[PDB]
Design a protein around this ligand. Structure first.
Ligand code: CHL
Ligand code: CHL
Ligand code: CLA
Ligand code: CLA
Ligand code: CLA
Ligand code: CLA
Ligand code: CLA
Ligand code: CLA
Ligand code: CLA
Ligand SMILES: CC1=C(/C=C/C(C)=C/C=C/C(C)=C/C=C/C=C(C)/C=C/C=C(C)/C=C/C2=C(C)CCCC2(C)C)C(C)(C)CCC1
Lengths: 31, 225, 194, 158, 73, 35, 96, 96
């Protein structure tokens, strides 16, 4: 059974939020 | 790169030697008068610009009359139908229209003057020149004055203006201009009335002078009555 | 003035001067001073076109005319090529005039801004609702009003995506509050540097 | 009488250059001086225009005739879209160069080989290089489109 | 290359290249922000070691996977 | 649908777009003068 | 003076001493037709700003990648977009 | 002085004509090695005529035009280079 498109896009949006948080951590490290 | 700035010391390939005036001291014994030398016989002088407008229409109508003359002499096609040859479609025909042309505008086969190609070149060349002549665009030759119909710098490489009397040459051009414009008007009216080219009308009028006139064709209604 | 959420901090370049300024620019697109008037005018244009589009969609739908997505295929007097040539010429001339006027250069302004903003949201909604359900805006509204509890975006094919996005929106300002009270708010970088 | 051709740069034998028939020949000097990059009195935008047109025109050709779709009927369209993409990349390279390169004062002036003091090239500045980049973009895209037109139009193209 | 040849050949080569770029027409319009220099001794030792190790690992990974998959899948 | 669309978008996004922006950005920062 | 015999140092003529010479540059103010200049000024009216070019290239990057992943790749008939359209093969040990 | 001389070429029309024609004439002289005592210039011109009939189609890889072209152009360019060297050297003090 393949993954539903909603599943893929929800995981991808969670990834986008994780990436935002990674940018926040990188900026905080750079200070 | 260093600045050389040497002396060119070049002379014109041809530079007409002084020949002066080849006309009588009287310059317009004909009907009317040149602008700036008397009062207009009939029509009111519209504006100072009208003299230069007359010169430009004159030179253009000279070139148009000679073009219709040579086109009908070399191809037999009337000038008023020569436009139908080069069209967005089948502009290949317009190529071989010059008697003795070593080569065609359209080499045999596809190779050809396209209407749009010709047109695009025509706009880009003639409009540029038209603008540069007038106040549009700018002046690429500061030594000459835009808005002057007789610049007489690079535009007389042979130097006839300075070689002779300038103003007699000017009036000579003006008379040629008015003659050719009136002849052009005659050509358009003949095209309208007889549907045949200028040299065709000439030939008909000289073969039998007594007939083949305005009034002869009027007897048939100019093919409309 | 009220900002884009209770407790937000407006960016320093968003001081309420512009119409509709709610201090919303997380990605700092209008941070550059010289492009900010351009971005204002891009907002106003996209809003105006969305407003006109919303009117021409809703009236068309409610008057029995062909559906907005189908309206292209209808048989018109002029074919596609001549119509696009007309469009290219006239819109080029009009947009040239608009550009030169822009180069030259309260209540009603704010009104227009808000209206355009709603329109752009409403137009995006119409396109998304058609792409997901295949129902036109008035049909979609009737379907929703028929069964409001279960017929919605969050129960459609993209439902979980929308629920996750709304969760992100609901949990963003709380994290921003932590960032303010814990961090110094002294970011040297912007999400869009130019 | 025993003429020597190769000479030091501007007669100074202590600068890292030598004037040769490749560098200081009159024909070479006139050709290079007439190229748009060396027209320092002209606006950087228009020099960038010609530059972009020339460069974007030729650069399309390799993609047309040697690209992946060179055999297909869409060879020209692929090659021209490749050329446009390369023009966009080079525009990005130009923008970043313009942002970074001109950050220093460069207090020393410039003179011609005749010794005439001349102003610095407006191209050699941040805003001037920005105008040059914009001219490059317009010229490159116009040249790529012209190459497409000519491949679709020119009679003896194959 | 990085392991055997050492800095000072490459520095002089870069010096000649600097001269060439500075004296090339139409290329002197573009100038480096950072002066181009050869890789330092430690830097180049590292770069060569990294290339050595990367090529070592990739070559053997390709071998051990391809042979085993060709004979067994 | 994800399978037929997302690879063809994200492979150029991660292998041509993101590299270009990242290299340009890093260049602009590294060459950025201290002041 | 820099122009003296066998003298190539001059604190007044620093440019000649240091070799900062304009080799091929020309300071002529106009070379192009003025209206052509006006057209190409208007064609790059908004792009003369560097950050405007940055926005142009970011938008162009996004649109080109979206169009390539949606329509451009298929239009170019890339083999990767075309399916395998062939029977599959089984690795050794009957491992598909 | 140490300034570059813009007349480095010293292009002399008499040198150009002397070198060109004083290679053409000897290369247009009878050569008993070639068939019918034809000259190198003769056979080269024959090959040029034969290949100019098919103007777009280039000469075949095996066609004798290439060898004639090389063996004629070498002698021509030798005459050009040596003629310039000898004239400018005689004008100068290299010989007398
Ligand atoms: C080189 C050989 C050649 C020869 C012998 C002719 C001969 C002729 N041409 Mg042609 N032409 C030639 C080449 C070309 N003509 C033309 C374009 C024209 C034009 C535009 C005109 C002539 C005209 C004439 C006639 C003028 C007689 C005098 O005066 C004559 C029949 C003239 C004509 O038709 O007079 C009625 C004329 O007006 N020819 C072009 C293209 C530029 C040529 C290029 O090779
Ligand atoms: C805001 C602009 C705009 C938008 C969002 C769309 C959107 C669409 N058009 Mg296009 N169009 C647009 C401008 C234009 N379309 C057309 C002419 C067409 C036609 C003729 C058709 C579309 C169709 C479509 C669809 C794509 C398949 C989609 C609904 C098709 C569709 O869905 O109709 C069934 C279709 O058949 N469009 C013209 C006239 C030149 C336009 C002028 O700007
Ligand atoms: C580190 C883990 C990792 C790795 C190595 C890969 C590798 C790959 N992914 Mg996958 N992916 C991951 C995590 C990962 N992914 C996660 C968590 C998600 C979200 C659910 C996705 C969602 C995803 C989709 C939807 C698609 C891919 C695709 C791809 C392929 C290339 C295109 C691309 O890079 O777009 C990746 C797309 C992104 C949006 C970025 C996702 C990457 C994660 C979230 C961040 C990883 C960052 C890393 C740890 C640190 C980077 C810093 C530095 C070292 C460079 C490639 C096989 C495409 C494919 O199969 O092409 C054939 C494709 O269509 N990926
Ligand atoms: C093939 C052409 C050729 C050759 C070899 C020579 C040879 C000579 N000329 Mg020159 N000359 C030529 C054409 C040639 N001339 C032409 C066309 C002109 C008119 C522009 C002149 C005008 C001219 C003047 C005004 C003077 C000379 C002088 C001389 C002599 C002095 C040395 C010299 O400059 O050459 C070097 C020549 C050598 C033979 C030295 C050895 C060279 C070796 C063997 C290699 C040569 C290869 C050979 C040429 C074959 C070429 C074919 C190629 C495929 C490799 C020398 C005998 C001067 C002199 O004193 O003459 C009385 C003199 O004052 N010449
Ligand atoms: C368009 C061409 C043209 C222009 C611009 C002028 C302009 C001028 N002429 Mg010239 N002239 C022309 C044609 C023209 N003339 C022709 C063809 C002739 C020969 C018959 C003359 C003979 C002539 C003489 C003998 C004299 C002038 C004079 C003048 C000046 C005074 C007149 C004036 O300003 O009003 C210009 C007003 C008009 C041109 C309007 C007249 C319109 C009528 C109805 C003619 C229309 C032609 C046609 C039927 C249109 C057909 C349309 C088509 C659709 C069928 C002025 C510089 C006088 C001068 O310099 O004064 C000092 C002077 O003495 N001209
Ligand atoms: C027979 C008609 C005719 C006559 C008499 C003149 C006479 C004159 N013209 Mg005009 N001219 C004419 C036709 C004519 N032109 C046409 C058709 C054009 C358009 C191509 C021009 C375009 C033109 C310009 C742009 C200029 C002149 C100038 C001149 C003057 C000197 C140069 C010259 O043409 O010497 C007379 C030459 C001939 C009579 C030979 C005609 C036959 C040839 C060989 C064909 C003189 C007033 C110049 C001037 O006045 O500056 C002071 C000037 O600048 N004319
Ligand atoms: C330079 C001036 C000029 C010249 C040389 C000619 C010459 C000619 N015309 Mg044209 N014509 C002209 C001006 C000119 N016309 C003008 C201004 C008009 C409009 C009023 C006409 C209208 C016209 C028509 C309708 C016809 C001619 C015809 C003719 C031919 C017969 C002669 C005739 O009946 O007198 C013509 C003279 C006038 C009408 C004087 C008008 C002056 C006001 C001859 C080739 C005929 C033809 O084709 O011959 C077979 C013919 O049917 N002409
Ligand atoms: C964004 C602005 C916009 C655009 C692009 C369109 C575009 C269109 N409209 Mg809409 N319309 C608009 C605004 C707009 N309209 C507004 C503000 C009103 C009010 C209407 C009222 C309206 C009616 C009543 C009809 C259209 C129709 C049409 C179509 C034919 C246009 C001509 O012919 C076309 C799809 C006609 C059509 O064919 O229906 C789709 C039609 O009957 N429109
Ligand atoms: C007017 C100059 C001209 C033009 C338009 C062409 C055009 C062409 N050449 Mg020719 N060619 C030229 C000069 C030219 N060549 C010269 C000076 C040489 C000698 C070095 C050649 C030698 C040459 C060869 C040997 C071949 C061509 C071939 C070709 C075609 C590729 C193309 C039609 C090729 C061909 O026949 O096309 C398949 C080919 O094999 N050319
Ligand atoms: C719009 C759209 C689209 C697109 C979209 C996208 C584009 C998405 C994405 C998403 C994404 C894009 C995601 C991402 C994620 C990421 C991540 C998740 C990352 C992470 C990272 C990390 C974790 C790192 C870290 C680090 C480093 C390494 C450096 C420094 C330090 C640190 C630690 C910070 C498409 C066209 C398709 C379709 C239509 C719509």
């Amino acid at each position: 059974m393949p993954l539903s498109d909603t599943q893929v896009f929800t995981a991808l949006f969670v990834a986008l939020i994780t990436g935002i948080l990674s940018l926040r951590l990188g900026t905080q490290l750079y200070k | 790169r260093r600045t050389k700035a040497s002396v060119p010391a070049k002379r014109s390939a041809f530079k007409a030697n002084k020949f002066g005036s080849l006309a009588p001291p009287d310059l317009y014994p004909e009907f009317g008068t040149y602008p700036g030398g008397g009062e207009s016989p009939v029509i009111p002088f519209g504006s100072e610009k009208n003299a230069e407008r007359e010169i430009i229409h004159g030179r253009w109508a000279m070139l148009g009359v000679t073009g219709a003359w040579a086109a009908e002499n070399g191809t037999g096609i009337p000038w008023f139908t020569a436009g139908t040859l080069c069209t967005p479609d089948d502009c290949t025909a317009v190529a071989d229209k010059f008697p003795g042309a070593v080569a065609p505008l359209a080499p045999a086969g596809s190779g050809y003057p396209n209407f749009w190609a010709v047109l695009a070149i025509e706009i880009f060349l003639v409009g540029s020149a038209e603008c540069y002549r007038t106040g549009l665009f700018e002046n690429p030759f500061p030594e000459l004055t835009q808005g002057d119909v007789t610049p007489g710098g690079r535009f007389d490489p042979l130097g006839f203006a300075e070689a002779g009397d300038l103003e007699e040459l000017k009036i000579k051009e003006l008379k040629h201009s008015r003659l050719a414009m009136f002849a052009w008007l005659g050509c358009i009216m003949q095209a309208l009335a007889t549907q045949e080219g200028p040299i065709a009308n000439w030939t008909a009028h000289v073969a039998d002078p007594i007939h083949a006139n305005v009034l002869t064709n009027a007897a048939k209604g100019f093919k409309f009555y | 003035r009220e900002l884009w959420y209770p407790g937000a901090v407006a960016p320093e370049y968003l001081n309420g001067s512009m119409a509709g300024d709610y201090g919303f620019d997380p990605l700092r697109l209008g941070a550059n001073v010289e492009t900010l008037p351009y971005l204002q005018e891009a907002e106003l244009m996209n809003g105006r076109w969305a407003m006109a589009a919303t009117a021409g969609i809703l009236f068309t739908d409610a008057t029995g005319l062909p559906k907005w997505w189908e309206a292209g295929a209808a048989d018109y007097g002029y074919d596609f090529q001549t119509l696009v040539a007309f469009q290219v010429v006239v819109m080029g001339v009009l947009e040239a005039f608009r550009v030169r006027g822009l180069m030259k250069t309260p209540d009603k302004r704010v009104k227009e801004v808000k209206n355009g903003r709603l329109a752009m949201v409403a137009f995006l909604g119409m396109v998304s609702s058609y792409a997901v359900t295949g129902l036109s805006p008035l049909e979609a509204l009737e379907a929703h009003m028929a069964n409001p509890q279960a017929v919605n975006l969050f129960t459609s094919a993209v439902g979980g995506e929308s629920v996750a996005f709304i969760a992100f929106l609901s949990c963003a300002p709380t994290f921003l509050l932590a960032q303010k009270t814990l961090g110094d708010g002294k970011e040297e970088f912007r999400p869009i540097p130019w | 009488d025993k003429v020597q051709i190769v000479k030091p740069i501007n007669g100074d034998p202590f600068i890292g250059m030598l004037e040769t028939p490749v560098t200081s020949s009159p024909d070479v000097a006139n050709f290079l001086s007439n190229l748009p990059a060396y027209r320092t009195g002209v606006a950087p935008l228009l020099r960038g225009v010609e530059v972009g047109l020339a460069h974007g025109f030729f650069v399309t050709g390799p993609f047309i005739k040697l690209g992946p779709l060179r055999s297909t009927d869409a060879a020209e369209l692929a090659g021209c879209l490749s050329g446009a993409g390369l023009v966009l990349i080079l525009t990005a390279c130009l923008s970043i160069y313009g942002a970074t390169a001109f950050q220093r004062e460069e207090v020393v002036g410039l003179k011609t080989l005749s010794g005439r003091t001349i102003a610095k090239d407006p191209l050699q500045s941040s805003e001037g290089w920005a105008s040059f980049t914009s001219g490059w973009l317009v010229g490159g895209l116009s040249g790529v489109a012209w190459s497409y037109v000519l491949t679709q139009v020119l009679p003896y193209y194959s | 290359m990085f392991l055997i040849s050492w800095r000072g050949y490459w520095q002089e080569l870069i010096e000649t290249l600097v001269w060439a770029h500075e004296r090339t027409p139409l290329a002197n319009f573009v100038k480096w922000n950072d002066k181009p220099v050869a890789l330092s001794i430690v830097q180049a030792r590292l770069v060569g070691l990294t290339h050595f190790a990367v090529g070592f690992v990739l070559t053997y990974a390709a071998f051990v996977i391809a042979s085993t998959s060709g004979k067994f899948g | 649908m994800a399978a037929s669309l997302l690879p063809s978008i994200f492979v150029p996004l991660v292998g041509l777009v993101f590299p270009a922006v990242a290299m340009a950005s890093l260049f602009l920062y590294i060459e950025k003068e201290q002041v | 003076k820099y122009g003296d015999e066998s003298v190539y140092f001059d604190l007044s003529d620093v440019e000649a001493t240091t070799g900062s010479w304009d080799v091929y540059g020309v300071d002529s103010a106009s070379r192009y037709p003025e209206q052509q200049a006006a057209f190409f000024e208007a064609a790059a009216q908004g792009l003369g700003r560097r950050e405007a070019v940055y926005s142009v290239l970011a938008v162009s990057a996004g649109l080109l990648t979206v169009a390539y992943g949606v329509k451009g790749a298929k239009d170019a008939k890339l083999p990767i977009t075309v399916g395998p359209q062939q029977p599959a093969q089984v690795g050794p040990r009957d491992r598909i | 002085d140490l300034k570059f001389d813009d007349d480095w070429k010293k292009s002399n029309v008499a040198v150009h004509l002397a070198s060109l024609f004083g290679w053409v004439i000897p290369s247009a002289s009878p050569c008993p090695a070639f068939p019918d005592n034809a000259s190198l210039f003769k056979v080269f011109s024959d090959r040029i005529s034969e290949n100019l009939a098919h103007f777009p189609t280039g000469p075949s890889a095996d066609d004798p035009i290439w060898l004639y072209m090389l063996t004629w152009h070498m002698g021509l360019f030798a005459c050009m280079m040596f003629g310039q060297i000898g004239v400018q050297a005689r004008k100068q003090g290299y010989f007398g």
